[PDB]
């Protein structure tokens, strides 16, 4: 009697839950919106922001008009290895934002020290990848890496048709700084992790003026396995793919199909990619060098670490963003906290969501949103940067573990101009010039120096329609 081979594992519901982190797959929580859960874990930040500036270079006629192409086929070139080393050292891989990806190994406390070790040398693995690796003219391509420990929050919101989520909390906050104390080949501790960590096991020396730690080598002591070591630590590791799946790098790519489920997890999933999932779309009509408006917003709070306060505001805002949005083919493209605030991604323009007069609706959107949110209980400033031009849309990871990201000079312009010009609504040069606006609907800015952008161009106050 027969007996066939290779289980099928390419149900729509396992190609969603490519979009999604196991805190979200395996996650069963109830309906209310906003949902909050509180754990202990380890972040890991990888930076790898040498392709905004490849993203440029991409854009020109050396590339033909291959450049999407051939700029989303070199990036998951790199982002899969450095994905495939989170997921089989255990990482749960939960957000991909242009710049960077964050990653959580989610623990009980007991054992964050030993899980510091594994995430440390996940690290140097991840930098052993670069060592000598480039891309001929230009530079080299390197990451940059931040780790933190400690108690974690997470934020589910949304409506009945969509839903987001957030990591929140000191630790959260920690792996940022961690992160931008970093140069080219660092590993940095923050001062928790440093404080939990086996100290016997990692040499680090000082950050200059810093509590943050550099690790310099991982020494173990004379009887340590690191496979043994490992092994252990897979007891605590809920999803480790194990014996018959011990082949896999996600559990996630055995989901069997689910309607219920299926129908929680499609609300996280932009209805493009769900279109591209179902076969109802070529898979490679969403990546693009595509003109497009970012309309980055920003909510700062008096305490961002307190879920319990901030999650009711967020739901609030988020509620009134998607009723403005949604009249504009509007997208939230991603949710994260920066180091100061949650912040909403925003995109005009997406494949297949082009609207006439673009720049006017993006403006009267800012608009509109700034008013809402500085009426919500919480919210202490909102912060609004609205920049066009054209940016790379695509879906960028690996195969098993991938999102739907914006990368570009105009994404950067958007972020730091909401940081740098806080609590009013600014635009750049194509926004105002190509808005269908009279000038005094604007206040021209001071030019600050911005921390990764290079000539901004004049920047602009959307003031709005009255002197009040
Ligand atoms: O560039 C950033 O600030 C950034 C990237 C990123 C990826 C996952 C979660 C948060 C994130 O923030
Ligand atoms: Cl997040």
């Known amino acids: 009697m027969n007996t066939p081979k290779e289980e099928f594992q390419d149900w729509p519901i396992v190609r969603i839950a490519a979009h999604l982190p196991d805190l979200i797959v395996y996650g069963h929580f109830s309906p209310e919106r906003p949902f909050m859960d509180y754990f202990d874990g380890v972040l890991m930040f990888v930076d ?15 590339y033909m008009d291959r450049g999407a192409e051939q700029l989303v086929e070199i990036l998951n070139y790199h982002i899969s290895a450095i994905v495939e080393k989170v997921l089989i050292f255990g990482g749960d891989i939960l957000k991909f934002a242009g710049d960077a990806l964050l990653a959580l190994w989610r623990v009980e406390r007991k054992q964050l020290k030993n899980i510091i070790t594994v995430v440390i040398k996940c690290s140097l693995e991840i930098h052993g990848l670069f060592e000598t690796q480039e891309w001929e003219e230009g530079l080299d391509i390197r990451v940059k890496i931040g780790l933190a420990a400690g108690h974690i929050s997470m934020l589910v919101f949304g409506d009945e048709t969509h839903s987001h989520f957030l990591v929140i909390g000191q630790a959260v906050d920690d792996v940022r700084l961690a992160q931008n104390m970093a140069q080219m080949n660092d590993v940095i501790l923050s001062p928790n992790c440093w404080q939990l960590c086996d100290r016997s096991m990692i040499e680090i020396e000082s950050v200059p003026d810093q509590r943050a730690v550099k690790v310099n080598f991982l020494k173990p002591p004379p009887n340590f396995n690191f496979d043994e070591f490992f092994t252990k630590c897979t007891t605590f590791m809920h999803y480790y793919p194990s014996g018959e799946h011990k082949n896999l790098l996600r559990l996630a790519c055995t989901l069997k199909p689910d309607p219920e489920l299926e129908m929680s997890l499609q609300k996280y999933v932009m209805e493009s990619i769900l279109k591209q999932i179902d076969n109802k779309q070529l898979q490679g009509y969403l990546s693009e060098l595509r003109p497009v408006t970012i309309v980055f917003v920003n909510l700062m709070f008096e305490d961002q670490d307190k879920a319990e306060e901030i999650g009711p505001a967020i739901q609030d805002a988020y509620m009134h963003i998607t009723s403005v949005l949604k009249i504009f083919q509007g997208q939230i493209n991603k949710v994260f906290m920066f180091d100061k605030g949650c912040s909403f991604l925003c995109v005009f323009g997406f494949p297949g969501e082009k609207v006439p007069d673009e720049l006017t609706h993006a403006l009267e959107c800012a608009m509109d949103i700034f008013d809402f949110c500085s009426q919500v209980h919480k919210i202490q400033t909102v912060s609004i ?10 879906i960028v990871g690996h195969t098993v573990r991938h999102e739907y990201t914006v990368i570009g000079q105009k994404v950067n312009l958007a972020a730091r101009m909401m940081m740098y010009y806080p609590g009013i609504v600014t635009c750049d040069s194509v926004t105002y010039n190509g808005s269908n606006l009279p000038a005094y609907f604007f206040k021209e800015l001071p030019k600050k120096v911005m921390k990764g ?10 003031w709005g329609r009255t002197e009040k």
Do not use: N, R, W
């Open 453 to 462: 952008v290079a000539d901004s161009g004049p920047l602009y106050q959307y």
């Open 48 to 62: 790898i922001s040498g392709f905004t500036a490849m993203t440029e270079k991409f854009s020109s006629a050396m």
């Open 385 to 394: 940067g609205v920049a066009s031009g054209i940016v790379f849309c695509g």
